[PDB]
Ligand SMILES: *[C@@H]1O[C@H](CO)[C@@H](O)[C@H](O)[C@H]1NC(C)=O
Ligand SMILES: *[C@@H]1O[C@H](CO)[C@@H](O)[C@H](O)[C@H]1NC(C)=O
Ligand SMILES: *[C@@H]1O[C@H](CO)[C@@H](O)[C@H](O)[C@H]1NC(C)=O
Ligand SMILES: *[C@@H]1O[C@H](CO)[C@@H](O)[C@H](O)[C@H]1NC(C)=O
């Protein structure tokens with residue numbers, strides 16, 4: 001969820017995200033090592049992921 | 059930054075007088091300081107422009123663009139450990 | 151006749167006994183105060199030294215565990231295996247304390263249980279023993295913080311953290327003080343066409359943060375190259391990065407725009423030219439050039455060979471923003487020079503990156519064995535734990551792992567962190583007793599930079615910068631800006647900074663405590679350097695405050711009648727009475743309501759600093775004698791609304807007992823404007839009451855008068871007390887009318903004007919009434935003015 005942690009082990013705990021890019025008004029938020037909505041982890045997952053691409057959506 | 063102002067007596071002389079020339083008119087004033095006391099007595103003439111404000115009013119400090127030309131005396135620290143030959147420049 | 155100055159003179163004179171006028175030498179006092187403050191600072195330095203030694207020795211043997219799921223570290227995280235603490239409402243720090251362990255404060259954006267953090271917790275957990283050792287071998291020590299170079303903060307007296315927590319020890323001024331030596335910054339903002347949009351926002355925010363990470367003892371400037379290296383601001387050279395200059399640079403940076411074509415060669419040439427302006431009082435050490443840009447394609451090899459041949463200057467470079475431009479040139483520019491290359495992908499990465507160059511700047515001092523372990527006191531700044539004004543001593547702790555094995559191939563060139571101790575100005579103030587001096591006298595000390603330290607005019611609130619705008623910086627007041635500055639005081643300031651010890655006398659103008667009057671008086675300055683550190687404690691004594699009265703009492707019977715002299719129930723026949731909140735031993739210290747303080751003092755004296763209480767009791771006795779003898783006699787004179795007498799020690803007495811309800815003067819005598827002013831002059835002083843006050847006054851209180859009670863005990867001028875009266879307005883209106891007539895005082899405050907409308911608005915500053923009268927009056931060598939500045943004030947906008 002935080003863009004400055006390129007691995008799960010370093011992606012934990014809270015982090016500061018700024019609303020709409022203004023330097024002021026920070027907002028605390030947690031870090032989640034979330035995967036893409038559609039991912040190629042499996043062959044089955046790949047097939048459904050590629051299906052939407054064939055549908056010109058997402 | 060508030061810009062305070064205060065006023066105080068300048069001359070030890072007591073008697074003062076003159077004329078006031080606000081506009082197309084004349085006035086008479088005579089001043090006299092109460093001896094052995096911090097008071098001044100003046101007699102202005104009846105009414106016939108720009109308000110002086112001794113109350114502190116918000117204002118910007120001295121223009122820093124001008125003060126840096128002649129900075130106040132300053133004696134900084136005299137150690138500043140830097141420039142050691144036995145240093146590693148492999149970090150980037 | 152009403153106040154009876156001569157009557158009090160006689161009352162004091164007849165009782166020659168109970169007086170022993172010791173002389174304030176003005177030199178032994180400053181000497182001893184300097185010695186005591188030096189001793190306190192050396193105590194703190196010793197504590198820091200031992201803490202640093204213990205921390206380094208503990209770090210030397212850690213073994214770097216990597217599986218903490220078992221044998222979990224035990225610590226008390228402030229932001230609430232954690233600990234359950236039992237808190238004692240200790241009044242020393244004004245908040246809950248434990249004294250049984252050192253709390254921790256992991257910044258919100260650092261994972262609590264990371265592998266690197268947990269190791270820091272583990273090896274620092276042994277520091278609590280030495281923390282307790284220090285706090286036990288001597289009390290009154292506020293904090294011991296170990297600002298590890300990972301964001302941690304292990305402060306010994308464990309209190310809950312004082313809403314989003316942005317605190318980060320690696321950015322606090324007391325950390326940057328020890329992390330690296332002073333600098334000569336030069337930020338090369340890249341305002342070129344390629345940085346339009348988000349990149350420019352990131353550049354401006356990062357530059358502002360960087361300027362926020364500069365102490366008040368290092369210089370800075372902000373250039374910019376867009377095929378032409380201009381300057382965003384009005385300075386055109388290095389400008390000390392003060393509290394003010396930072397604001398100018400921040401505004402200039404905020405008001406920039408992307409345009410033109412990038413030109414690194416010309417920009418770097420301009421930059422290297424600016425750092426060679428040796429005749430502008432530069433802090434000639436740690437030269438730096440921190441280029442900001444999106445991405446380059448030309449490495450200025452020729453410029454780096456023309457200037458910076460010997461690698462004198464360092465060059466950091468930020469590749470701010472998300473883009474796809476080449477970064478090889480920037481990395482190479484950082485690498486060739488003794489610098490380091492960073493990246494700022496987006497907001498959030500600014501705070502953790504802009505502060506990293508201090509790690510690089512610390513390499514030479516780390517490589518220096520022990521010449522760098524020098525306690526380095528900071529400048530006054532508001533504490534992060536809401537404690538007041540505290541100056542922090544700092545001492546870096548180095549990384550000694552593999553020492554005595556001579557491996558010397560490791561990351562032993564980076565400090566573990568700066569770890570400091572805190573000294574509160576309220577603690578220094580009790581080493582310089584003001585009560586022996588007259589209300590006008592006081593102490594003050596100044597940084598080498600001139601910034602004041604322990605000055606009466608230093609109020610605990612942020613120093614203002616510019617006018618506020620419609621919708622943490624240290625409290626640094628330059629010594630000339632804390633008082634009226636002239637051509638004489640500047641010489642004193644210059645001499646103190648150099649450490650020269652000498653005494654000077656002259657006649658200067660003092661801004662009264664109400665910021666509404668100015669008077670001429672003599673102020674024999676005196677200064678000396680505290681050899682322990684870099685400071686210059688001063689001392690201001692008027693010519694009439696050389697000698698002071700100290701009371702000696704042994705009968706204990708007169709002490710009794712003095713003890714019940716100021717009882718609350720004797721007011722009806724002895725007039726109301728105040729007592730100054732002075733430290734009469736551990737007696738309760740009052741805050742707002744003086745009545746309970748008087749009751750507590752009565753209880754304390756009934757039960758049983760001895761000289762100070764003796765002086766207060768003697769003053770109470772003499773004031774009671776005066777009031778009962780005379781003021782009880784000619785009660786309620788025709789035009790005397792009320793009568794009051796103020797002495798030293800804190801005895802203020804008002805006779806009618808009804809004017810007390812309309813007595814706005816502060817109970818403390820040393821803070822009473824009229825008292826100091828009345829001492830300053832040698833004639834009756836009239837105080838015009840304020841105008842349009844939410845509270846009552848100017849008709850039911852009356853104008854105030856005062857006159858210092860000069861005394862000659864043995865040929866020495868003394869002005870211990872002041873006797874004044876509050877003349878009723880109506881009676882002396884009747885007087886004046888019996889004789890456009892305007893009665894006025896210095897400061898242009900209408901006491902009366904014959905016209906009824908004017909005297910209706912009595913007390914308003916004359917000048918909102920007939921401005922032209924004064925506008926001409928100021929021109930004829932009467933009613934001059936001194937347009938001074940007050941940097942500590944509050945505004946509505
Ligand atoms: C400081 O300097 C010297 C000590 O050698 C002496 O003249 C002076 O009394 C010293 N005072 C203090 C407070 O250190
Ligand atoms: C300095 O420390 C010593 C040792 O605890 C103590 O006796 C002395 O009073 C301290 N000095 C001050 C000024 O607190
Ligand atoms: C480090 O952790 C181990 C295991 O928890 C512990 O035995 C050791 O005491 C810790 N280090 C220190 C300095 O206490
Ligand atoms: C911003 O800088 C430009 C530079 O020409 C200037 O014209 C403009 O007045 C400045 N605006 C402010 C608010 O300082």
Ligand SMILES: *[C@@H]1O[C@H](CO)[C@@H](O)[C@H](O)[C@H]1NC(C)=O
Pocket residue numbers: 427428429
């Ligand atoms: C200071 O140095 C600059 C740059 O070399 C030069 O232009 C200027 O004349 C110098 N001024 C003085 C007073 O030395």
Ligand SMILES: *[C@@H]1O[C@H](CO)[C@@H](O)[C@H](O)[C@H]1NC(C)=O
Pocket residue numbers: 549550551560561562566
């Ligand atoms: C201290 O230096 C050693 C050198 O090997 C390093 O392993 C260690 O991590 C350093 N200290 C910390 C707290 O990282």
Ligand SMILES: *[C@@H]1O[C@H](CO)[C@@H](O)[C@H](O)[C@H]1NC(C)=O
Pocket residue numbers: 842
């Ligand atoms: C006093 O100040 C208030 C401020 O709101 C103003 O409304 C009122 O008219 C003033 N009155 C006088 C007598 O100055």
Ligand SMILES: *[C@@H]1O[C@H](CO)[C@@H](O)[C@H](O)[C@H]1NC(C)=O
Pocket residue numbers: 925926929
């Ligand atoms: C005030 O004094 C100045 C300077 O002497 C003079 O120029 C001016 O005419 C005088 N009168 C006024 C109304 O300013």
Ligand SMILES: *[C@@H]1O[C@H](CO)[C@@H](O)[C@H](O)[C@H]1NC(C)=O
Pocket residue numbers: 634635636934935936937
């Ligand atoms: C205050 O004003 C007087 C008279 O105008 C002048 O002589 C003096 O130098 C001024 N001092 C300051 C500090 O402004």
